[PDB]
Write an enzyme that holds these catalytic residues in place. Structure first.
Site, PDB file in Angstrom:
ATOM      1  N   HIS A  62       0.850  -1.146  -0.196  1.00  0.00           N
ATOM      2  CA  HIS A  62      -0.003   0.043  -0.019  1.00  0.00           C
ATOM      3  C   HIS A  62       0.946   1.215  -0.027  1.00  0.00           C
ATOM      4  O   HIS A  62       0.532   2.267  -0.603  1.00  0.00           O
ATOM      5  CB  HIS A  62      -0.772   0.041   1.237  1.00  0.00           C
ATOM      6  CG  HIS A  62      -1.656  -1.158   1.289  1.00  0.00           C
ATOM      7  ND1 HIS A  62      -2.592  -1.840   0.563  1.00  0.00           N
ATOM      8  CD2 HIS A  62      -1.517  -2.346   2.467  1.00  0.00           C
ATOM      9  CE1 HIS A  62      -3.257  -2.950   1.250  1.00  0.00           C
ATOM     10  NE2 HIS A  62      -2.348  -3.240   2.279  1.00  0.00           N
ATOM     11  N   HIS A  92       5.078   7.033   6.916  1.00  0.00           N
ATOM     12  CA  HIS A  92       4.842   6.728   5.473  1.00  0.00           C
ATOM     13  C   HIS A  92       4.290   7.732   4.852  1.00  0.00           C
ATOM     14  O   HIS A  92       4.069   8.787   5.278  1.00  0.00           O
ATOM     15  CB  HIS A  92       4.024   5.540   5.457  1.00  0.00           C
ATOM     16  CG  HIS A  92       2.776   5.980   6.258  1.00  0.00           C
ATOM     17  ND1 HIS A  92       2.347   5.650   7.558  1.00  0.00           N
ATOM     18  CD2 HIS A  92       1.589   6.447   5.572  1.00  0.00           C
ATOM     19  CE1 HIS A  92       1.134   6.114   7.699  1.00  0.00           C
ATOM     20  NE2 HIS A  92       0.643   6.611   6.458  1.00  0.00           N
ATOM     21  N   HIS A  94       1.520   9.254   1.591  1.00  0.00           N
ATOM     22  CA  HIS A  94       0.534   8.978   0.338  1.00  0.00           C
ATOM     23  C   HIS A  94       0.781   9.966  -0.755  1.00  0.00           C
ATOM     24  O   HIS A  94       1.316  11.092  -0.482  1.00  0.00           O
ATOM     25  CB  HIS A  94      -0.587   9.198   0.842  1.00  0.00           C
ATOM     26  CG  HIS A  94      -1.086   8.683   2.248  1.00  0.00           C
ATOM     27  ND1 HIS A  94      -1.644   7.301   2.358  1.00  0.00           N
ATOM     28  CD2 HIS A  94      -0.655   8.993   3.459  1.00  0.00           C
ATOM     29  CE1 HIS A  94      -1.816   6.923   3.362  1.00  0.00           C
ATOM     30  NE2 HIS A  94      -1.327   7.554   4.285  1.00  0.00           N
ATOM     31  N   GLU A 104      -4.068  13.586   1.370  1.00  0.00           N
ATOM     32  CA  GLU A 104      -5.097  12.760   1.934  1.00  0.00           C
ATOM     33  C   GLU A 104      -5.941  14.062   2.459  1.00  0.00           C
ATOM     34  O   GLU A 104      -7.394  14.611   2.123  1.00  0.00           O
ATOM     35  CB  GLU A 104      -4.768  11.699   2.932  1.00  0.00           C
ATOM     36  CG  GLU A 104      -4.363  10.578   2.292  1.00  0.00           C
ATOM     37  CD  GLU A 104      -4.429   9.342   3.049  1.00  0.00           C
ATOM     38  OE1 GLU A 104      -4.405   9.275   4.315  1.00  0.00           O
ATOM     39  OE2 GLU A 104      -5.019   8.296   2.572  1.00  0.00           O
ATOM     40  N   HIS A 117       2.832  10.965   7.047  1.00  0.00           N
ATOM     41  CA  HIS A 117       2.325  10.802   8.306  1.00  0.00           C
ATOM     42  C   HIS A 117       3.183  10.084   9.247  1.00  0.00           C
ATOM     43  O   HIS A 117       3.971   8.977   8.804  1.00  0.00           O
ATOM     44  CB  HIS A 117       1.347   9.737   7.902  1.00  0.00           C
ATOM     45  CG  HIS A 117       0.025  10.232   7.261  1.00  0.00           C
ATOM     46  ND1 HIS A 117      -1.003   9.627   6.681  1.00  0.00           N
ATOM     47  CD2 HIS A 117      -0.249  11.763   7.106  1.00  0.00           C
ATOM     48  CE1 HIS A 117      -1.825  10.439   6.192  1.00  0.00           C
ATOM     49  NE2 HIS A 117      -1.368  11.744   6.299  1.00  0.00           N
ATOM     50  N   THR A 196      -6.081   6.442   8.293  1.00  0.00           N
ATOM     51  CA  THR A 196      -6.716   6.497   6.922  1.00  0.00           C
ATOM     52  C   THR A 196      -6.363   5.139   5.831  1.00  0.00           C
ATOM     53  O   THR A 196      -7.079   5.342   4.907  1.00  0.00           O
ATOM     54  CB  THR A 196      -5.943   7.724   6.186  1.00  0.00           C
ATOM     55  OG1 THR A 196      -4.851   7.482   5.994  1.00  0.00           O
ATOM     56  CG2 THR A 196      -6.444   9.085   7.094  1.00  0.00           C
TER      57      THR A 196
HETATM   58 ZN   LIG Z   1      -1.101   7.622   5.973  1.00  0.00          ZN
END
Ligand SMILES: [Zn+2]
Length: 258
Positions: A62, A92, A94, A104, A117, A196
């Site tokens: 992911h 990590h 996104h 996000e 994050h 999330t």
């Molecule tokens: Zn995250």
């Protein structure tokens, strides 16, 4: 099969396995900068990352997680909206397929190229697994990324990605200093929300920094060369691993700054 970011298993599907996806305190959200209220009661935010001990980096199918040794009070977040001490366990990102999306959280509907994050757990619950089950168990420090000048502090992350291209790959990743990923200002918005990614638990105090960091186009391009798929499976580039903004549901977003 299991959850992801595509047409058949993406965010719009998650509620079927994880009904809390339609809950009252889901993340991310759009941050309406005009309705966010300055809160004089917020204490100053304390990001104490001097003794942070990174262990490994992992492609989990992911994103990639940089993991820390959280067996002692080493890298901790406190103050601001938080009570007590929150230990850094991993970070990590996104990101998007293109620079115009990837974050996000959004800011007056603006999407940033990526979002970092930094995930912490409340030490009063003893471990991550217990903390993530409590309404005040987690604190996520979210930092926007825009494309511009290179971030020198990110480059060590960027250079290791070739070794973790596919799902399930990991590598040693010691002595990485997360201080190199922080903007000058600690001005932030805060609100109560959720993880999330599944299981989307409603355990997070979100602390989203106003000031983005700049990374280079070459840096984010290297994120986009990762794969969602495992070794020797059809290649699906790891891009657009972001959950879109969720209903605020009368939650109040507070600003640390006037
Ligand atoms: Zn995250």
């Amino acid at each position: 099969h299991h959850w992801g970011y595509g047409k058949h298993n993406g965010p719009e599907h998650w509620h079927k396995d994880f009904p809390i996806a339609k809950g009252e305190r889901q993340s991310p959200v759009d941050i309406d900068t005009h309705t966010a209220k300055y809160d004089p009661s917020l204490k100053p935010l304390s990001v104490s990352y001097d003794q942070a001990t990174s262990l490994r980096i992992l492609n989990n199918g992911h994103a990639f997680n940089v993991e820390f040794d959280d067996s002692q009070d080493k890298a901790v977040l406190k103050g601001g909206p938080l009570d007590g001490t929150y230990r850094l366990i991993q970070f990590h990102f996104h990101w998007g397929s293109l620079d115009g999306q990837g974050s996000e959280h959004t800011v007056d509907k603006k999407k940033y190229a990526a979002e970092l994050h930094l995930v912490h757990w409340n030490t009063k619950y003893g471990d991550f697994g217990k903390a993530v089950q409590q309404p005040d168990g987690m604190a996520v420090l979210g930092i926007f990324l825009k494309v511009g000048s290179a971030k020198p502090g990110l480059q060590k992350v960027v250079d290791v990605l070739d070794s973790i291209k596919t799902k399930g790959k990991s590598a040693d990743f010691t002595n990485f200093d997360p201080r190199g990923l922080l903007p000058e200002s600690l001005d932030y918005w805060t609100y109560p929300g959720s993880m999330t990614t599944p299981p989307l638990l409603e355990s997070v105090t979100w602390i989203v920094l106003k000031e983005p960091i700049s990374v280079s186009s070459e840096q984010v391009l290297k994120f986009r060369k990762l794969n969602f798929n495992g070794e020797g499976e059809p290649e699906e580039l790891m891009v657009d691993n972001w959950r879109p903004a969720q209903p605020l549901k009368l939650r109040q977003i507070k600003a640390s700054f006037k």
